[PDB]
Design a protein around this ligand. Structure first.
Ligand code: CLA
Ligand code: CLA
Ligand code: CLA
Ligand code: CLA
Ligand code: CLA
Ligand code: CLA
Ligand code: CLA
Ligand code: CLA
Ligand code: CLA
Ligand SMILES: CC1=C[C@H](O)CC(C)(C)[C@H]1/C=C/C(C)=C/C=C/C(C)=C/C=C/C=C(C)/C=C/C=C(C)/C=C/C1=C(C)C[C@H](O)CC1(C)C
Ligand code: SF4
Ligand code: FES
Ligand SMILES: [Ca+2]
Lengths: 97, 157, 221, 743, 42, 81
């Protein structure tokens, strides 16, 4: 259900609660910890990030490498947090390489 | 050892070297032909051209045309080859007319196979192309005439 | 440990714990590397054991009648070969008390009752001495090793209560089993090629060696 | 190093949960549908194994079990054929009188008047005349009762269940690993010596013991029920020794090396059997013996486990010279890591083989009573030509797939491939030129001929009467093949076929089995047309393969895949640059070439080969012999072949051949229906679907899986599929109606 | 078994069954009342 | 059959091929011929007991070759004279 989320960020690391049927981005939108986005549609790399633990539902994710979902990177705006997760933010370019 | 090499050691030009394009026999032969005699008057080369090709174009029009068996008209079908010579020399003329202008140098390459400068081949002029045209045409009609002159029985008339 | 056509591949896994281990495996069938279904080496050892046991039984049985056809009041109509008793009706049949098809069904029923339980001992070792079987379960417990179950039934006389005992006896058993397997194969191809019967064949060879083997390559039939 | 069995236990578990979740194999499909496009993709990518995953082991496991599934299907189809021969056929009566009863193994129920399709096929039976030639096979096999057909149907059903179980087993319980598959030396040793050697040895055995004696009895005139059963021939041998004295010595020669004493039934005759119009069975048994020996020896070339043999890598590395650099070094690494390279080579060879089978089976008829059954001969030649062409085109498809997805000079470098890639421009230039020149000098002659025939100038034609173009080499070769038996082949009596010549003609039942086929100007023209069509098909397919990765127009084409619509309308427009589009275009040209091949064969056989012979010995051909003089113009093809022979199919309404009349028209319809998909584009269709969707929305009846127009590539594929089906089915109906009607 | 019940309701299988039953029904109707051009009842 | 007929021919043929294979002069299980000129050495792993490294695989191979070659020349000589 509404597992706790953990996001490392240059601002720090903060937690907010939010049901599994949601995308991470609107839920960091709720409590008010600002994150970088451009598209909100899963077709760019501004909302990119990687994981510390658990793993996130990436069913409705697209425009990604047939690997970007098997070695860590995730787009925060099309992602369902199946577990109590611990994630990274501002991770576009070390993804952009 | 390998036989094919890039053209003059440059492996980024769109071609190769083989025993077909760069071979001593082929090189010497192709060099001694009219089109590749750069330092010669255009009209002489054209003369060789027209001679050979009128003489060659005699045979087929004679031995295959509509009146091949009618020989009150079989041999005199050299009229046809004369007409073909006329037509493709008209084509030569319009090609030269459109491709060149006298007040412009000749587009031929100035470098040679080893990297020395050459005086650009004048056949690629406007002037010299008209000269070569006249030569080819003169040769073509009179070569038609020559191979019609040899109507004497040989092996296959 | 004498070796027959051994190799550095076969001699790796054939250490010697098995009876009659001669390191002979020129095809590499016991290799435990890529083992799956019915290629596992334990099952191959069990299968050799069962083949040899049945071969001892069947090889002594397929020749017994036509030997007693010659000595005693044993009636000749009940002195047939092993191929003219009903095994191949295009080669000779008999009229027992049943049909030879009812015979097949009934024999299959009895052997199903036997072999399903023997397998279930192989698969979940110790299963059959737990469910009710009208009694008959206290003796079908097992011994951890499929091919040597023991009990009050399969070992009444109590042979081999030590280790040298069992190893020596097991060696002799597997060797005799191999010999009888060879013998049954010989039965088959002799009884085809000469087409008369192994006992009669032996008695036709003991007299003269004129027609030992290559003579019968004319293959009368 | 050494060769062994290597298997994993229980890799995947048998379950139904994945059946209820459509598109489990691909992550994109698994997510589920938003639009109808999903439903199409689900089927298009179903067997693209190496795209569902990256692991070679998984792809090979899937391929192995898929092959088992295909074999199970084939066994079920064979089971059906034998059961229908046993249960709904007139095979026994045909066995009694083969040259009057026309074979039939399918009857129809009387439901809507369709029982008219149950026609009088002779023998007290009413059904559909079949053209697969199964009765001829069953007679050449020795089969004489319907109980044997029942038995083989049951055996085939059992074998099909066995194949299906093995397919499940090797995927879910005992799945072999990659090193098992990648052992090609042991595989070749087994297929050469075990599958092909032992196979033809066992078959030669069956012919020596069953087919030969039962056919001897049948040709002697004995009633097919009073012939002994085959197994009698094995139990009692005096039966065999009555027909072939050599069976008295019985394998003593085969050891005493006096093989001469078997000349009874192992012959080298050549020519046909003048009683049944087929090859001598005593020749076929001896042939199979020889082929088995050859294959059994050839299956002992490659080293597996005992030193002796040949290393394929060593053979390939040994071959190289001053024109090809290092060539063949690096092909063993390639041919063992890509399934697509293997599939391309295999498809090429199997297609060529099928075409060769077509030619050899018309020219030297193997089965008895097949040569005079004209419908079966036409059907078999045509069927096998089509199969061969299709397989050859698939070869190009998978060579292109290898070039796009697998070729990699960074980790698997081969020299010959690199050099061909480095002069592809000259290659394609010369092939283009030769196709243009070949097209001018073959079709151009036809156009010259039509124009000279319409201008009242037949003395200016290209024909046997005016301007002769005799194929001297073909005439010279068949003359050499005529004089061969006795001069360059002293051991032969008659020559290999009756088409070579020698003045020998074979007849059966008052019909012509075979006679010498005459070559003339028309044969010269037709063959150069054929060379033209094959060269063009090659140009298209090879251009598709060689430029699959990059071009001067699109320099990074490999990054767009193997099957993509275009790279946009810029650069002038780049529709159909992909290699898939080259395969799509090559299918039309294969259709063209094969169609002309089967038209040439069909007209030539009726005109100069088939017909009826009289007791006095005057042969009347089906068509009058008009191929020599009417085939040289296009008007003669339109008039004397199409218009004159379509009469049988346009007059079948009311007879038992009316199904062909219905299929003629249906096939024309399907062909014309494909042009709509081929001539249009999906923008128009999506915009029309917009308004239709509006109308549905107006009534709260609009679907949730949003309807889309088809893909660009799907449009092309639907188009070519319906085009091929329509055209081939039209020719199918035409041929079968025509050949069945006259005879 | 539940998964089988779901699978049997997937689109191709459902349509296959629906149309096979419909075909049997029309076939039997035409086998009983053959060659109908009109409604001959009322 | 045994006497002085095919017997002589086939026996001497298979015997000379076995004599070749055992010693050098012929490719074998422990000998890899390069290109028909000379032979290398190789331990196939299959253990034998013969002092020259003569395997059973080697014996089978050279026996088959002897039989093929003998059958060939026997049939030839008895077909020409
Ligand atoms: C539409 C007008 C047209 C006309 C009037 C002709 C007329 C003729 N054609 Mg022709 N043809 C045409 C269109 C035409 N064609 C087209 C469009 C094609 C393409 C399909 C052809 C393809 C064709 C072929 C393949 C052939 C002909 C041939 C012929 C000649 C046959 C009769 C003959 O033997 O004459 C008498 C025989 C002669 C040799 C007369 C030669 C004519 C004079 C002497 C040539 C002098 C030329 C002159 C120096 C300059 C050339 C033209 C100039 C006025 C610009 C005839 C003069 C045949 C032929 O004879 O070949 C020459 C023949 O082979 N035609
Ligand atoms: C599992 C092994 C095996 C099998 C399958 C058979 C099978 C058979 N035996 Mg045999 N037999 C065997 C072992 C075997 N035997 C052994 C180990 C011996 C002692 C060495 C014999 C000694 C033997 C004799 C003497 C005879 C048979 C006979 C027979 C046949 C009928 C037996 C019968 O009526 O059933 C049993 C019925 C009962 C009421 C009990 C039958 C095909 C008989 C036969 O058919 O004569 C040719 C025959 O007389 N057997
Ligand atoms: C004498 C040994 C032998 C024989 C007869 C075959 C025969 C066959 N192989 Mg095979 N293979 C062998 C050894 C052998 N193989 C070895 C040693 C390897 C590598 C270790 C392979 C690896 C291999 C692969 C990767 C593939 C084949 C395939 C095939 C089939 C090819 C298609 C065909 O022609 O169908 C002809 C159809 C018939 C002849 C019908 C009769 C079928 C009989 C019963 C086949 C039984 C032979 C088989 C070896 C039995 C072993 C099973 C046993 C343990 C119970 C064919 C039946 C293809 C395949 O598997 O298709 C499923 C294929 O993909 N083989
Ligand atoms: C794998 C194929 C095959 C098989 C299974 C058989 C099987 C058989 N053959 Mg045989 N045979 C074959 C191929 C085969 N043959 C070929 C290709 C030839 C031509 C050289 C012969 C020529 C041949 C002869 C001359 C004889 C047999 C005979 C026999 C039978 C003798 C029984 C036996 O001893 O074994 C047997 C059923 C013998 C026989 O007829 O027994 C009835 C017999 O004398 N065969
Ligand atoms: C041994 C033969 C063989 C094998 C194993 C394969 C295997 C494969 N091919 Mg291939 N191919 C072959 C022969 C073969 N092909 C031949 C002969 C051709 C020439 C036509 C091609 C041309 C070809 C192309 C162009 C492509 C492939 C592709 C593929 C891959 C995916 C196929 C797929 O699942 O699509 C799904 C299968 C279907 C959707 C079924 C199509 C149904 C057809 C169109 C209807 C036919 C009508 C029917 C015969 C009669 C009408 C019945 C009706 C009236 C009821 C796959 C690995 C594709 C690929 O991407 O490779 C990676 C690819 O695009 N193949
Ligand atoms: C170049 C054309 C040619 C062709 C295609 C053939 C083909 C054939 N010849 Mg032949 N031959 C030829 C020229 C040719 N010959 C000439 C010019 C002569 C001299 C006049 C002979 C003399 C000759 C004789 C005496 C015999 C044959 C035989 C045969 C047949 C068996 C082949 C064989 O022995 O396997 C090949 C044998 C090998 C050892 C493989 C060698 C591979 C070759 C040489 C390469 C075969 C169909 C035999 C026959 O009659 O069959 C019944 C036979 O008796 N030929
Ligand atoms: C729009 C096209 C069209 C139309 C209007 C018809 C109409 C008709 N067809 Mg036809 N048909 C067509 C296309 C068409 N068909 C095509 C394309 C084909 C080729 C496949 C055929 C092939 C065909 C055949 C072979 C036959 C017909 C027959 C018939 C008649 C059947 C009457 C009937 O079924 O009884 C009554 C049926 C009912 C009353 C069903 C309703 C009852 C429901 C289920 C119960 C509801 C209770 C509340 C009917 C007048 C049959 C006939 O008799 O021809 C004269 C027949 O033999 N058709
Ligand atoms: C049929 C192939 C073959 C096979 C299977 C063998 C097998 C064997 N050879 Mg022999 N050998 C062969 C061919 C073969 N050889 C040939 C062609 C020659 C040349 C004539 C020899 C010459 C030879 C000699 C001189 C000796 C053997 C010995 C042996 C044995 C050594 C193993 C042992 O006893 O102690 C482990 C062994 C069983 C040795 C032996 O008998 O043991 C003392 C030995 O003395 N071999
Ligand atoms: C050294 C003694 C010897 C002698 C005197 C002979 C004599 C003969 N052999 Mg023979 N042979 C021998 C040794 C010998 N052989 C050995 C040791 C072997 C085993 C290697 C063979 C294997 C062999 C075979 C397989 C054949 C003969 C054949 C022949 C006979 C005719 C071949 C011929 O000349 O026609 C000329 C042959 C040709 C021109 C071959 C051309 C055909 C090829 C296949 C076409 C070219 C395509 C190619 C694949 C590319 C001939 C009487 C043939 C035969 O059986 O006679 C009835 C036959 O086919 N022999
Ligand atoms: C080791 C190895 C390994 C490597 O690597 C390879 C190789 C070489 C392959 C291998 C192998 C070898 C071998 C030899 C094998 C074999 C076996 C056998 C023989 C078995 C039998 C086995 C056998 C068996 C079981 C048998 C059994 C039998 C029986 C019961 C009998 C019965 C009977 C009788 C009484 C009588 C009646 O009237 C009939 C009957 C009923 C019939
Ligand atoms: S969208 Fe269609 S028309 Fe436009 S470039 Fe692509 S293939 Fe051509
Ligand atoms: S905004 Fe770019 S992915 Fe969400
Ligand atoms: Ca193993």
């Amino acid at each position: 259900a509404s597992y706790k989320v953990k996001l490392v960020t240059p601002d720090g690391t903060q937690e907010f609660e939010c049901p599994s049927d949601v995308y991470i981005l609107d839920h960091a939108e709720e409590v008010g910890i600002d994150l970088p986005y451009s598209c909100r549609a899963g077709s760019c790399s501004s909302c990119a990030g990687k994981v510390v633990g658990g793993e996130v539902d990436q069913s409705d994710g697209s425009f990604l490498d047939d690997e970007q979902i098997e070695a860590g990177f995730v787009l925060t705006c099309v992602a369902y947090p199946t577990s109590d997760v611990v994630i990274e933010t501002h991770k576009e370019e070390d993804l952009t390489a | 050892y390998q036989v094919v090499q890039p053209i003059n050691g440059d492996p980024f030009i769109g071609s190769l070297e083989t025993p077909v394009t760069s071979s001593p026999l082929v090189a010497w032969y192709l060099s001694n032909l009219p089109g590749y005699r750069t330092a010669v008057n255009p009209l002489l080369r054209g003369i060789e051209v027209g001679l050979a090709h009128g003489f060659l174009l005699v045979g087929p029009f004679v031995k295959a045309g509509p009146l091949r068996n009618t020989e009150i008209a079989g041999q005199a079908g050299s009229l046809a080859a004369g007409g073909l010579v006329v037509i493709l020399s008209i084509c030569l003329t319009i090609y030269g007319i459109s491709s060149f202008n006298e007040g412009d140098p000749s587009t031929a390459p100035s470098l040679t196979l080893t990297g020395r400068k050459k005086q650009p081949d004048q056949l690629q002029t406007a002037d010299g192309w008209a000269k070569f045209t006249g030569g080819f045409f003169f040769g073509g009609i009179s070569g038609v005439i020559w191979a019609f002159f040899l109507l004497y029985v040989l092996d296959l008339p | 440990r004498p070796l027959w056509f051994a190799s550095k591949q076969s001699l790796s896994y054939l250490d010697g714990s098995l009876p009659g281990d001669y390191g002979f495996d020129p095809l590499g069938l016991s290799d435990p590397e890529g083992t799956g279904g019915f290629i596992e080496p334990r099952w191959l050892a069990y299968g050799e054991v069962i083949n040899g046991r049945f071969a001892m039984l069947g090889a002594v049985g397929a020749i017994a009648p036509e030997y007693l056809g010659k000595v005693g009041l044993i009636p000749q109509e009940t002195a047939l070969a092993w191929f003219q008793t009903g095994v191949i009706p295009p080669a000779g049949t008999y009229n027992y008390w049943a049909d030879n098809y009812t015979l097949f069904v009934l024999e299959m029923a009895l052997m199903g009752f036997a072999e399903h339980r023997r397998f279930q001992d192989w698969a979940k070792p110790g299963s059959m001495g737990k469910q009710y079987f009208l009694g008959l379960e206290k003796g079908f417990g097992g011994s951890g090793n499929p091919a040597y179950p023991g009990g009050p039934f399969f070992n009444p006389l109590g042979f081999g209560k030590d280790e040298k005992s069992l190893k020596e006896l097991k060696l002799k058993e597997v060797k005799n089993g191999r010999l009888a397997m060879l013998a049954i194969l010989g039965y088959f191809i002799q009884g085809l090629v000469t087409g008369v019967g192994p006992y009669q064949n032996l008695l036709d060879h003991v007299a003269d060696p004129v027609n030992n083997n290559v003579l019968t390559s004319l293959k009368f039939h | 190093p050494e060769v062994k069995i290597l298997v994993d236990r229980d890799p995947i578990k048998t379950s139904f949960e994945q059946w209820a979740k459509p598109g489990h194999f691909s992550r994109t499909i698994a997510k589920g549908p938003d639009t109808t496009t999903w439903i199409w993709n689900l089927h298009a990518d179903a067997h693209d194994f190496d795209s569902h995953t990256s692991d070679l082991e998984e792809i090979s496991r899937k391929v192995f079990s898929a092959h088992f599934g295909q074999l199970s299907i084939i066994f079920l189809w064979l089971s059906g054929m034998y059961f229908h021969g046993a249960r709904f056929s007139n095979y026994e009566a045909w066995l009694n009188d083969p040259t009057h009863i026309r074979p039939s193994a399918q009857v129809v129920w009387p439901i809507v008047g369709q029982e008219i399709l149950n026609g009088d096929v002779g023998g007290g039976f009413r059904g559909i005349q079949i053209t697969s030639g199964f009765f001829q096979i069953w007679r050449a096999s020795g089969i004489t009762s319907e109980l044997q057909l029942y038995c083989t149907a049951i055996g085939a059903l059992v074998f099909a269940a066995l194949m299906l179980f093995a397919g499940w087993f090797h995927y879910h319980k005992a799945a072999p690993k990659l090193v098992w598959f990648q052992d090609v030396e042991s595989m070749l040793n087994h297929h050469l010596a075990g599958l092909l050697g032992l196979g033809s040895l066992s078959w030669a055995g069956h012919q020596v013991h069953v087919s030969l004696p039962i056919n001897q009895f049948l040709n002697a005139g004995v009633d097919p029920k009073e012939i002994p059963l085959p197994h009698e021939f094995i139990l009692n041998r005096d039966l065999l020794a009555q027909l072939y004295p050599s069976f008295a010595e019985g394998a003593t020669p085969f050891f005493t090396l006096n093989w001469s004493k078997y000349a009874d039934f192992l012959t080298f005759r050549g020519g046909l059997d003048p009683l049944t119009g087929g090859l001598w069975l005593t020749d076929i048994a001896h042939h199979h013996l020889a082929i088995a020996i050859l294959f059994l020896i050839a299956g002992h070339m490659y080293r597996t486990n005992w030193g002796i043999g040949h290393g394929i890598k060593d053979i390939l590395e040994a071959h190289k010279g001053p024109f090809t650099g290092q060539g063949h070094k690096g092909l063993y690494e390639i041919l063992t890591t890509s399934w697509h390279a293997q599939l391309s080579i295999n498809l090429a060879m199997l297609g060529s083989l099928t075409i060769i089978v077509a030619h050899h089976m018309y020219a030297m008829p193997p089965y008895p009573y097949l040569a005079t059954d004209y419908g079966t001969q036409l059907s078999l030649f045509t069927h096998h030509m089509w199969i061969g062409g299709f397989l050859i085109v698939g070869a190009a498809a998978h060579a292109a797939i290898f070039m796009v997805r697998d070729y990699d000079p960074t980790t698997r470098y081969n020299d010959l491939l690199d050099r061909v890639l480095r002069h592809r421009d000259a290659i394609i230039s010369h092939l283009n030129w030769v196709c243009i020149f070949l097209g001018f000098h073959s079709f151009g002659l036809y156009i010259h001929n039509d124009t000279m025939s319409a201008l009242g100038r037949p003395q200016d034609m290209f024909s046997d009467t005016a301007i002769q173009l005799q194929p001297v080499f073909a005439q010279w070769i068949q003359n050499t093949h005529a004089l061969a038996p006795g001069t360059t082949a002293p051991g032969a009596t008659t020559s290999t076929s009756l088409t070579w010549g020698g003045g020998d003609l074979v007849s059966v039942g008052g019909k012509v089995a075979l006679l010498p086929i005459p070559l003339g100007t028309a044969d010269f023209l037709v063959h150069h047309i054929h060379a033209f069509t094959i060269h063009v098909t090659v140009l298209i397919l090879l251009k598709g393969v060689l430029f699959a990765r990059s071009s001067r127009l699109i320099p990074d084409k490999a990054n767009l895949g193997f099957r993509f619509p275009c790279d946009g309308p810029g650069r002038g427009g780049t529709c159909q640059v992909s290699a898939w589009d080259h395969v799509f275009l090559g299918l039309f040209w294969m259709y063209n070439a094969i169609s002309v091949v089967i038209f040439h064969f069909s007209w030539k056989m009726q005109s100069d080969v088939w017909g009826s012979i009289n007791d006095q010995g005057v042969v009347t051909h089906i068509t009058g012999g008009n191929f020599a003089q009417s085939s040289i113009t296009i008007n003669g093809w339109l008039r004397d072949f199409l218009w004159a022979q379509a009469s049988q199919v346009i007059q079948s309404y009311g007879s038992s051949l009316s199904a062909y009349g219905l299929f003629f028209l249906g096939a024309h319809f399907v062909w014309a229906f494909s042009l709509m998909f081929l001539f249009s584009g999906r923008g128009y269709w999506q915009e029309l679907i917009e308004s239709i969707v509006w109308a549905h929305n107006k009534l709260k009846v609009a679907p949730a899986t949003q309807p889309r127009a088809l893909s660009i590539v799907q449009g092309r594929a639907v188009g070519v599929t319906h085009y091929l089906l329509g055209g081939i089915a039209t020719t199918w109906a035409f041929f079968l109606a025509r050949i069945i009607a006259v005879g | 078994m539940r998964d089988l019940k779901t699978y049997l309701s997937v689109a191709p299988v459902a349509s296959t069954l629906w149309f096979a039953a419909l075909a049997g029904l029309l076939i039997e109707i035409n086998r009983f009342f053959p060659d109908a051009l009109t409604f001959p009842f009322f | 059959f045994i006497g002085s007929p095919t017997n002589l021919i086939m026996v001497t043929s298979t015997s000379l091929m076995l004599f070749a294979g055992r010693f050098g002069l012929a490719p074998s299980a422990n000998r890899k011929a390069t290109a028909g000129l000379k032979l290398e050495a190789r331990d196939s792993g299959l253990q034998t007991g013969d002092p020259a490294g003569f395997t059973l695989a080697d014996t089978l191979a050279c026996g088959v070759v002897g039989h093929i070659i003998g059958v060939g020349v026997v049939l030839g000589l008895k077909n020409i004279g």
